[PDB]
Paper text:
[name] is a Gram negative, anaerobic rod that is the principal causative agent of ovine footrot, a debilitating disease of the hoof of ruminants. In strains that cause virulent footrot these proteases are called acidic protease isoenzymes 2 and 5 from virulent strains ([name] and AprV5) and basic protease from virulent strains (BprV). All of these proteases are synthesised as inactive precursors with an N-terminal pre-pro-region, a serine protease domain and a C-terminal domain of unknown function. [name] adopts a subtilisin-like fold consisting of a curved six-stranded parallel beta sheet sandwiched between two and five alpha helices.
C141S is a substitution derivative of [name] in which one disulphide bond has been removed. To test the importance of the Cys89-Cys141 disulfide bond for proteolytic activity, we also used site-directed mutagenesis to convert Cys141 to Ser141. Although this [name].C141S derivative was still active against small peptide substrates, we noted that the ability of this enzyme to degrade fibronectin, insoluble elastin and proteins from sheep hoof was reduced. Finally, the ability of [name].C141S to degrade sheep hoof material was significantly reduced compared to [name] and AprB2. Together these data suggest that the integrity of the I2 loop and the Cys89-Cys141 disulfide bond is important for maximal [name] protease activity. The structure of [name].C141S was very similar to that of [name], overlaying with an RMSD of 0.21 Å for 339 Cα. The structure confirmed the absence of the Cys89-Cys141 disulfide bond and revealed that while the I2 loop had a slightly different structure to that of [name] there were no significant differences in the structure of the active site or primary substrate binding site. The average B factors for the I2 loops in [name] and [name].C141S were 14.6 Å2 and 28.4 Å2, respectively, indicating that the I2 loop is more mobile in the substituted protease. Steady state fluorescence quenching data showed that the wild-type protease was more protected from quenching by potassium iodide than the C141S enzyme, confirming that the conformation of the I2 loop in [name].C141S is different to that in the wild type. The disulphide bond tethering the I2 loop appears to be important for this function since its disruption alters the mobility of the loop, which significantly reduces the ability of the protease to degrade fibronectin, insoluble elastin and other proteins from the sheep hoof.
Author numbering: 2 to 340
Amino acid sequence: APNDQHYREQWHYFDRYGVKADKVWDMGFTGQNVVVAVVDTGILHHRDLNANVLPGYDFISNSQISLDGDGRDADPFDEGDWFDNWACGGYPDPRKERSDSSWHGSHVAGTIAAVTNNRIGVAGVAYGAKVVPVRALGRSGGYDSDISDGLYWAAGGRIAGIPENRNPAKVINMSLGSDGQCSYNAQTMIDRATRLGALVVVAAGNENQNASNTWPTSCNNVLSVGATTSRGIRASFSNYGVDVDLAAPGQDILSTVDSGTRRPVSDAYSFMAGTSMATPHVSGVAALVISAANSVNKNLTPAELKDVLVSTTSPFNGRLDRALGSGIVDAEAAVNSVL
Ligand SMILES: [Ca+2]
Ligand SMILES: [Ca+2]
Ligand SMILES: [Ca+2]
């Protein structure tokens, strides 16, 4: 077991309806030599992340989304996607007036590979793995073509006027999405990323609607992730349906953020809910599964990896409100299967 101060609060790693990450660390697999790309709001300079973060890239083209004064650049720092006075919003809706910065991509990155065994803060599912921040979201979200470009690069794809990725990822985490069917361009980048060897792991979404009505779930060649609670049932906001492949803890998830309401001020930790929190659990387990597959000289295709994760899930608590894949992702059964 990890020595980090607040690991006990991370029920989602160890408890009844957790991901049994502890049972894999017991075997010596922590995702060593695995790289996971996080296509999200970018990364904080956080004492509980720094050492597990690789060079990334900022794909945000609009400088009024990026909030760092230019388009695409080599620094994936999360400037903070805060906004005032309906700057992203449907005025006059009071619920759309203002958001503090989410630190979303850092909360996601922490779930995968927070610095673990360094006493401070929290653990990550795959703390021996490293994270490549692919910043594609900022104030208001992000363009789909920035997201698509970002995910292709994340897998080792070359992009015009961007230096080659030295750290191509075996797993690409997309804690994001919106309404509408998968675009041609998105589907194409996903297929190309997959042909490079990457597993694309995506959030089902948070609108209590059929995930098929959204992307990236409606795309081929993704692993779509629903959200469960500490009681092993569907979190009420989680999207659902036949295209949800499996589920993972998506409520009361503790990870790494900043205290700043606008720009980074100091390292913090908070709880979040969302299929966005569930996804990095599956991406971390994916990395665990790969480290174990490496150990017995076994190569796994994205298709093989997705089937290993989908077939080795633990049961839900009851038949569930809605369809939410095969079960809760289960690192113990997944790893045991490949050995
Ligand atoms: Ca920029
Ligand atoms: Ca930047
Ligand atoms: Ca820590």
